[PDB]
Design a binder for this molecule. Structure first.
Ligand code: 9J3
Ligand code: ZN
Ligand code: ZN
Ligand code: ZN
Ligand code: ZN
Length: 263
């Protein structure tokens, strides 16, 4: 309840509520032409309802390789659970994970500093997160080392040649795709997960039979645990602990690793 946590939003969850295509909040959008010079723009998704309090925010980065598939589906799916979601446009000029990390941070800076007042009136600037696909997932990792005050990080089929992440202090949930040949889990996702501190709240979820572009298509297994991770760490909402610990065992999941329980 709200008494023990002022950041709780929405009714008490179930497996069904985390799997829902839309949560309890209706969602509005705001296009942004540019959030920083050189970095391009994106789309902000925000809950319309203000009567439960302000919300944390997640910036969402795409990958590098050409694909008309996108990150847009995360926008309303996640925002409708009570979050501000800023999907960042593709940018072929940013060809390194560190650049995508800086892009993620610039997007968050914009949200906090000078986004439309409708968004800022709904925003808790102290509770921010990053998520990204592929090189953008590498960027999520990079962003957390650059900004350890972030509340959560979700690298989706992440790609990064830097394999060492022992300095990450932000709760990190890595999603891998079994059949990924672009960011293979054996040399990307798994070494990232294993290098994160043993005392970090962390998880690794691998999707059975999934290709590299699985995160670009609506996927309930991804969504339900992304939602649960953001709830648990951006909102400190322990009502969502039930879905994260003990480890998920959904049929769609190849393997799950975690540092449960999350104190
Ligand atoms: C979507 C795949 O593209 C990436 O973001 C990672 C792999 C690459 O940089 O070629
Ligand atoms: Zn409570
Ligand atoms: Zn490193
Ligand atoms: Zn499998
Ligand atoms: Zn369950």
């Amino acid at each position: 309840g709200p008494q023990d946590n002022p950041y709780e939003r929405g009714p008490d969850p179930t497996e069904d509520s985390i799997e829902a295509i839309r949560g309890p909040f209706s969602v509005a959008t705001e296009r942004v032409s540019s959030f920083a010079s050189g970095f391009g723009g994106g789309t902000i998704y925000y809950p319309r309802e203000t009567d439960e309090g302000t919300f944390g925010a997640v910036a969402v980065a795409p990958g590098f390789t050409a694909s008309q598939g996108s990150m847009s589906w995360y926008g309303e799916r996640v925002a409708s659970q009570g979050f501000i979601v800023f999907t960042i446009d593709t940018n072929t000029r940013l060809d390194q994970p560190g650049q995508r990390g800086r892009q993620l941070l610039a997007a968050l800076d914009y949200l906090v500093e000078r986004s439309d007042r409708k968004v800022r009136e709904r925003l808790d600037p102290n509770r921010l997160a990053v998520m990204g696909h592929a090189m953008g997932g590498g960027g999520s990792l990079e962003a957390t080392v650059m900004r350890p005050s972030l509340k959560a990080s979700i690298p989706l089929t992440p790609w990064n040649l830097d394999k060492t992440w022992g300095q990450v202090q932000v709760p990190t949930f890595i999603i891998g795709a079994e059949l990924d040949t672009i960011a293979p889990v054996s040399t990307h996702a798994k070494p990232f997960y294993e290098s994160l501190p043993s005392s970090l709240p962390k998880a690794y979820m691998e999707l059975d039979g999934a290709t590299h572009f699985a995160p670009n298509i609506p996927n309930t297994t991804i969504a339900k645990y992304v939602i649960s991770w953001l709830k648990r760490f951006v909102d400190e909402d322990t009502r969502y602990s039930q879905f994260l610990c003990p480890n998920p065992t959904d049929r769609a999941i190849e393997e799950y690793r975690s540092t449960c329980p999350y104190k």
